[PDB]
Ligand binder design. Structure first.
Ligand SMILES: *[C@@H]1O[C@H](CO)[C@@H](O[C@@H]2O[C@H](CO)[C@@H](O[C@@H]3O[C@H](CO)[C@@H](O)[C@H](O)[C@@H]3O)[C@H](O)[C@H]2NC(C)=O)[C@H](O)[C@H]1NC(C)=O
Ligand SMILES: *[C@@H]1O[C@H](CO)[C@@H](O)[C@H](O)[C@H]1NC(C)=O
Ligand SMILES: *[C@@H]1O[C@H](CO)[C@@H](O)[C@H](O)[C@H]1NC(C)=O
Lengths: 285, 83
């Protein structure tokens, strides 16, 4: 059952800042009391962050390119962002993997899904529970299946601040999709604020499929459709050089771009966060 | 599978993909639930987490060094001491 909406406002492409987010544990290896260089895909500091706002008549989830691996953030109080479809053609012509939370399970499923052009959950706004699972019409040649443990999720619409900030990073390398997770509590109206939180690896899924595009699976709140205030933020990664900082408890405590200015790139070379006066040599031009 | 424990002897361990030699000993390093093994300031895999018991162990180098012979001379004695 594929149901598209009636009066969706055109997308905003409203841009925001990336100030100090995008940090994740790059590996599974313990270090302590140290600095450590990496060459990997990262969000650069203070970058254009496309905020897709779901407001009263605005239901933003177009076909969004995965191109290099993406950064995702979700500003949540009522759990509108519940799933994603990943793939290339976004039809039943190519293999698409869908990873959702259906308020019972974390469900991972990779098939040739007949994609509905408008994926959503419909939730009865006066009743407060999920009504519809309008995701896919058909599914065949299912390559991977996963359904998590049963758990009871908060579905109904809330009011006030965005309390829940869930940050996700998806990374296709060696036929896998590296899945990164992180959470902090927030309280804000709009415009994803500054902060610093290391994201954690949760899944390294052997999918082996061509994923170039994606689309988020949102949650319509219906009194067909209606929306509530939620926003989710688009970030691309870029192969950068960062330097981490491990404490005595093995926590990533500080990160530094080697690319935003000649200042911090010098800090990558000298390998300290503080440098006294003087002139110092870095690489060629 | 012979997943035993030989502490305080130079052995040639093999974990789930982690090979090498050395003397094994218990560690007290603060891991995470997703840590598997740790490295020092160098690039050696220093600590290790048991695939069987999830015990944090650190790996020490076996034994090495140089030898220096101490003699008082030939015309007086012939006994020596080592270092
Ligand atoms: C690494 O992490 C550990 C644990 O998070 C830190 O040790 C903790 O230090 C605090 C304060 O220094 C200790 O709290 C104290 O507990 C006693 C007894 O409950 C209480 O009476 C005091 O008022 C205070 O709250 C805590 O027990 C201690 N935990 C452990 C396991 O040692 C450590 O400081 C961290 N180190 C670094 C470099 O981050
Ligand atoms: C993107 O970020 C730059 C700063 O790097 C800023 O000058 C520019 O206005 C931003 N673009 C939009 C559309 O906001
Ligand atoms: C042995 O040689 C040392 C010098 O190497 C000399 O001082 C000593 O007198 C010698 N002793 C004898 C018994 O020749």
């Amino acid at each position: 059952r594929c149901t598209t909406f009636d009066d969706v406002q055109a997308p905003n492409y409203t841009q925001h800042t990336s100030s100090m987010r995008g940090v994740y544990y790059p590996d599974e290896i313990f270090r302590s009391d140290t600095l450590y260089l990496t060459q990997d895909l990262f969000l650069p500091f203070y970058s254009n962050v496309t905020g897709f706002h779901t407001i009263n008549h605005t239901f933003g989830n177009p076909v969004i390119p995965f191109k290099d691996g993406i950064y995702f953030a979700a500003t949540e109080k009522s759990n509108v962002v519940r799933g994603w479809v990943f793939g290339s053609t976004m039809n039943n012509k190519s293999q698409s993997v869908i990873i959702i939370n259906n308020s019972t399970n974390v469900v991972i499923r990779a098939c040739n899904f007949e994609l509905c052009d408008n994926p959503f959950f419909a939730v009865s706004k006066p009743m407060g529970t999920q009504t519809h699972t309008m995701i896919f019409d058909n599914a065949f040649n299912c390559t991977f299946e996963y359904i998590s443990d049963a758990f009871s999720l908060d579905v109904s619409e809330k009011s006030g601040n965005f309390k829940h900030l869930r940050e996700f990073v998806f990374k296709n390398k060696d036929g896998f999709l590296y899945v990164y997770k992180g959470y902090q509590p927030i309280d804000v109206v709009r415009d994803l604020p500054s902060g610093f939180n290391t994201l954690k690896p949760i899944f390294k899924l052997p999918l082996g499929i061509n994923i170039t595009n994606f689309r988020a699976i949102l949650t319509a709140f219906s009194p067909i459709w209606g929306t509530s205030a939620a926003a989710y933020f688009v970030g691309y990664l870029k192969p950068t050089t960062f330097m981490l900082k491990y404490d005595e408890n093995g926590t990533i405590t500080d990160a530094v771009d080697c690319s935003q200015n000649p200042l911090a790139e010098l800090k990558c070379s000298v390998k300290s966060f503080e440098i006294d006066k003087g002139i110092y040599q870095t690489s060629n031009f | 599978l012979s997943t035993d424990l030989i502490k305080n002897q130079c052995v040639n361990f093999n974990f789930n993909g982690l090979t090498g030699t050395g003397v094994l000993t218990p560690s007290s390093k603060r891991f995470q639930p997703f840590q598997q093994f740790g490295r020092d300031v160098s690039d050696f895999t220093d600590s290790v987490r048991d695939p069987k018991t999830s015990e944090i162990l650190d790996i020490s180098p076996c034994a090495f060094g140089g030898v220096s012979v101490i003699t008082p001379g030939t015309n007086a004695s012939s006994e020596v001491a080592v270092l």
